[PDB]
Amino acid sequence: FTVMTKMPGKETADRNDPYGETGFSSIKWYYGILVKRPERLALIKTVAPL
């Protein structure tokens, strides 16, 4: 992950907002898998009783 917290007051100051009031917090990540042996994954599809 990559957590980024910009608390309001000194970093959120801007020309459109000289008055630091706004803040945020963003978390982002990459993901992906590689399948080597597909035949070793086994699945059964079925109906489940209520």
Binding site: V3, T5, K6, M7
Partner: protein, 51 residues
């Protein structure tokens, strides 16, 4: 321009509960602080290499 003339100095460091509990007499009011979820992600001004 002289450090001897300075009135105050403030420093932020990272510490764990065991360090504070080494000497119990000096430190009080440890029960109120939420050790289980308080994290340094909450405090961005501190600059450190910890993930």
């Amino acid at each position: 321009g002289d450090i001897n003339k300075a009135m105050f100095a403030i420093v932020s460091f990272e510490t764990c509960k065991a360090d504070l509990l080494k000497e119990k007499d000096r430190y009080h009011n440890l029960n109120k602080i939420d050790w289980q979820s308080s994290a340094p992600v909450n405090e961005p001004d501190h600059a450190t290499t910890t993930p």
